Design a protein around this ligand. Structure first.
Ligand SMILES: CC(C)(COP(=O)(O)OP(=O)(O)OC[C@H]1O[C@@H](n2cnc3c(N)ncnc32)[C@H](O)[C@@H]1OP(=O)(O)O)[C@@H](O)C(=O)NCCC(=O)NCCS
Ligand SMILES: CC(C)(COP(=O)(O)OP(=O)(O)OC[C@H]1O[C@@H](n2cnc3c(N)ncnc32)[C@H](O)[C@@H]1OP(=O)(O)O)[C@@H](O)C(=O)NCCC(=O)NCCS
Lengths: 391, 390, 391, 391
């Protein structure tokens, strides 16, 4: 058996929509986190065989931004690079695909994760035919290609309404979970628990460079009362609000992967061994249930029981879906998203899966957790999961 | 682990703004997915995952690979995703599918590529807002598909770079394009694309139209018409519209499973995937990609170049193709025997799966044992895959 | 009492939408008509004091296309020029306004009319504030700024339906009117009656200049059957169709104005004397009724009865409204649009008023008619009318 | 011997580019000024015969914004309305065109002036032919149709440079003039001298209506040093800067006109009698010189010497051109733009001619000036001037 380790890992801070990284291309965020994982493992950019980056919204950024991030990071031209899209699942899925490159003896050293600038996503129109007369639409690729179900034509937040109703999750319960996520994240932030995983990013300016190293979407002093004033965002008699869904965000996150024996030759003390992974499909109307079969198949492939897990990162696309997954799987909620989740931290789609992986790993190192699981729901009706054991 | 291609299908390749001018990529993908199932005799319910290369998905909606999958009747339980190694994507996707199976994560994979260059939109980033002055609406087909991100120029400039390096004449590159057209017109007329093509039905308001012929192939291609063309990228250049491939639409896929599985199902596979490899090269000379990628593929298969019976080497430009032939030194008679991308067209994310199909089906026809498929990639890469027949 | 004459007049052929003049800016057409009126009067460009050109759709054409047209035509930089917009009324209203320049002693020689390139009208969006997220429309300025009612939000065609209903005008009556417009226009064209009024226009090419001197929108051999098969274009239970409405078209048309005393000094035999004009408002919902009060008011001011008129040009925006106007005024339809109207000839919005003035003046001359009237309905609920007498 | 008076007048505050009126359609600003002139004169909306509004940048605003403005202000559907465009000349030219409707007996009561939203001007492109392949430009219509010379291809600011070189006007002279304009405007705003002319405009807001009644573009405490450090904006070795040019601005301004005998019957004390007006062309290259022949011609027509004038408003498109006009005319600079000019106040193009008329009229009344003149330069090479005497 192969045995592949996460040697090192790093993420930018998650930026607020049209905020800190409002004008920063995904691959620039990418390059920073690629350099990061190299430096942190003590491996030279010249040793990297291939870079694999999940990205959902790459229109107008030019040819293969995975290669632009690779090349900017100083990964030599001789290496290879590609992007991929399994939507919200992409940044964790890229990690599993890198693992496979090594397992099959096609690569020795892989940098894998994801990057997203939802800010820099353009508006678009098909205009070759040419428009003889009449208005036409300029389509927001963020919304069209990121947030709109292709089969049912509505937003992801409507899929969360479907799950809410399915599981009979109240507005109060979904708000209670949001305020708890914000509080957990504000606590971890203040306590320095995100410092290890975050690599600062320098936004180059005209009248000044600006170093970003703090998650800017977390709201300080989140109360239940403010949560409860909000209006439903997708259904007028609905439960889901801007306050209990994640936001629109920018960021990047990566992991350096190699064989267990290679990390040992190099004196590297890996963050984890990738024990299993699994991806599964579900009905798109209730895509927020994805993590349930994916996490169960992952655990099955680890040969692990749910109760064996010491720490979980289960992405918070919406408080409605997150509460459902927790309810179903039954794992102790106190070991879930201990430093808060995507409602607080944000949801830079193609990067999210590597973002939460980062957060799991560094917290597993911090508390001395042995066994961890990362899981995400996926628009169009999928889920992805990964099991990690500490060395 | 021994992973075979059970079956393969591709759409005909359309001309830019032509047969598929208003057909979303994923509808071309779905036809190709259903065709691989049907040809193998495998139920859609049995597919674990669909992996589709695609370079130009803007505005087509969430995860068009999943859209293709669902429209093809693959149940909601399966998974799907897209990937982009530019022109390698459609072949790389097949290596990626093979890997899912070789690591025991999946049993049956459909893999390939899909591209509508015609449906690629224009775009601009407009959230900041344009306070004053003119701005550009960007052709994502050009920006995201054909322009080098490091040097800022069109792929055809990289093909010029290779032409100067390998001292390839305008006559030589024209000779290669006329030769590719003649081969592809002969093949077409001879019925040699029939097997590999699945017809696609363009749904219309005043009539459905069935597309089952590659419409970019030009009939009666003469050196004269080639020799009159003006260079397309350098005013003192050698690259033209006629000795470069085109902008095109299409899909192409393969059904992958283990060799033991194929035999349990009584399926006579198109080939066993013996190796593959991808390597990087200077972006400036990206057309050279197939050189290191086919040597590494050949070294991983444990084959010599002389062992190959048939080769598909994608013709992005006459100059890069001639260059790769010259260095690898394989018999040009066994290379793109039914023509190439110059004649056939070059639907970016689909090309690698396109040339795979041609190779597989021609191998079966003429009874070749060992084949190789390879492509150059924008940004400076190569991908290659070694196939042996059962 | 000041007396102003129309010394000379000319118009381009009226181009089909995206047809002969598809890529010709409105001011190039205008310049040709300016040159033509000068040459027909025996007046030099040096002598013009001001150019006044109606134009509804100048977006993207640059600073003040009226000045562009004047300068191209050799009118000296010491002259002045300006555009105006009273929608369909514009090309006729420009004439009245140029008569007023002379009447108040501010100018001696005016060129006035209108020009329009519906073909070259752009699509637009307000983008300065930025579009933070979600789709936006690229608006067709031709439809938005030319053809849509600003108050009720519907197309001019809907105002036509409102008039069809009010006056109980059958589909059969409108279609017959439309077929009669085509057939009269075709006859006039074939017999050479548009030759005098038309100045040929040279579309400069690349692989060859093309001279345009024939109205291209006129359908030859128009049948009642073909009119009858068309579907209503604005209201699914409607009566107004593409066939019994005017079209989208390009063209220019002008008049050279001076005092009666000045024409006499120059030895010019003028096309006519401007005896009166008028403009009046009506309800936007039935804008097609504008010509009713405008004509009555114009006639009152001239001291004429409806029965005094020898020829009439009443613009055919739509068969419904044309029929309503004829019914209410009660003038002999055999003297109205004797050479066809806009259903056949086309409707280059800002040019149309001076286009039907041209047609009226050259027909008055041909047939020896002493008294004429030109009138148009106007988007937003107005009418304009002018009374002309022969010298 | 017709004598037309200005019965009442009003303007909005002039907003900054994308400032107070950033999302306010021009006709909304026009409607408030229409209402204000009516209330100020004691004339009812029912009595208005026509509304005439200069406007250069109406693209995307829909059919005939002048009619939109009128209708909004409650001017009856039976009145008429139209827009016109002689660039910077427009708002003043409309007042002359308004005068002429009364003089020729075609109307009794006119509201005339101008309105402009430079902020709301869209970007556009001609897309009907259709873009086969490649990038294309979205054109800024405010720059294209408002600010760029159609003959020479360069900005109005280059024409200012040409005037600077011809009249040898230093950077120090232009900057001193600019600072003076700011400091005069600031003192006037502070002392309340814009109150009488300004009608407050209510900007309707989701989370609050905002009343705008102060000119927001005037810089308070403007320093010479601030002006001196700017880089030339149009030529690298040039002299014209963003500081000694006018701005991009939004606003509206109008005058209610009637015969002198009519104002007498109603007991209205008019703001002034329109004694004369003129418009003349110059070389487009030196368009800022337009006020010179236009003001001389206007004075000739009034039978006045330059020395008879008690107050002048000479629009400050650029310091360079304002200086050249003042030098050539030789009028006492202490009677010119007494309360500041467009450098400070701003330049909402189609409204500007009416804006400066408002300032002249209310300052004439305040100080008891008997004889006044308003003039502006005009893109494409023209000037317009009007003479006003007090009753
Ligand atoms: C009415 C209008 C919307 C129709 O535009 P359109 O549908 O794009 O024009 P088309 O020519 O394609 O009309 C559809 C059909 O009518 C047919 N046609 C028009 N008149 C016909 C007639 N005389 N007999 C037979 N066919 C006729 C065309 O051949 C066409 O056929 P197709 O569908 O096969 O191409 C457009 O002309 C319009 O907005 N005009 C009104 C303009 C206006 O209101 N001007 C301002 C005045 S207030
Ligand atoms: C001149 C022009 C091109 C400048 O464009 P701009 O760069 O977008 O204008 P900005 O305000 O952003 O830039 C001017 C700078 O000088 C400063 N500035 C402006 N006026 C100033 C003054 N009076 N004193 C000191 N500084 C001043 C501003 O603060 C700004 O500095 P900043 O960017 O650090 O904030 C533009 O205003 C213009 O086209 N105006 C001319 C209008 C015209 O031609 N009208 C028609 C006449 S025919």
């Amino acid at each position: 058996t192969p045995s592949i380790v996460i040697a090192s890992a790093a993420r930018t801070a998650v930026g607020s929509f049209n905020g800190a990284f409002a004008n920063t291309p995904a691959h620039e965020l990418g390059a920073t986190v690629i350099s990061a994982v190299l430096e942190r493992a003590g491996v030279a950019a010249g040793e990297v065989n291939e870079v694999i980056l999940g990205q959902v919204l790459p229109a107008g950024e030019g040819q293969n931004p995975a290669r632009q991030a690779a090349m900017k990071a100083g990964v030599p031209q001789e290496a290879t690079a590609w992007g991929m899209n399994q939507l919200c699942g992409s940044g964790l899925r890229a990690v599993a695909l890198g693992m496979q490159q090594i397992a099959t003896g096609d690569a020795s050293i892989i940098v894998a994760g994801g990057m997203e600038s939802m800010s820099m996503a353009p508006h678009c129109a098909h205009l070759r035919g040419g428009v003889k007369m009449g208005d036409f639409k300029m389509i927001d690729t963020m919304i069209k290609d990121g947030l709109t179900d292709a089969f049912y034509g509505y937003h992801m937040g409507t899929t969360a309404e479907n799950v809410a109703k399915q599981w009979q999750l109240s507005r109060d319960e979904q708000d209670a979970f949001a305020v708890a996520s914000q509080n957990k994240a504000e606590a971890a932030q203040k306590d320095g628990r995100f410092k290890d995983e975050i690599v600062p990013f320098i936004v180059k300016g005209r009248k000044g460079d600006i170093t970003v190293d703090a998650d800017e979407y977390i709201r300080h002093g989140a109360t239940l009362d403010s949560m409860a004033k909000l209006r439903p965002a997708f259904d007028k008699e609905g439960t889901v609000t801007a306050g209990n869904a994640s936001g629109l965000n920018d960021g990047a996150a990566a992991a350096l992967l190699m064989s267990e024996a290679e990390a040992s030759r190099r004196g590297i003390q890996p963050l984890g061994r990738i024990v299993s992974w699994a991806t599964v499909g579900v009905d798109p109307k209730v895509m927020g249930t994805g993590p349930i079969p994916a996490s169960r198949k992952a655990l099955e492939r680890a040969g692990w029981k749910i109760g064996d897990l010491d720490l979980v990162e289960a992405n918070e696309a919406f408080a409605a879906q997150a509460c459902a997954v927790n309810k179903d799987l039954g794992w102790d909620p106190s070991i879930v998203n201990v430093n808060g989740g995507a409602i607080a931290i944000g949801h830079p789609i193609g990067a999210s899966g590597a973002r939460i992986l980062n957060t799991l790993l560094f917290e597993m190192k911090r508390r001395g957790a042995r066994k961890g699981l990362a899981t995400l729901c996926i628009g169009g009706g999928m889920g992805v999961a990964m099991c990690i054991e500490s060395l």
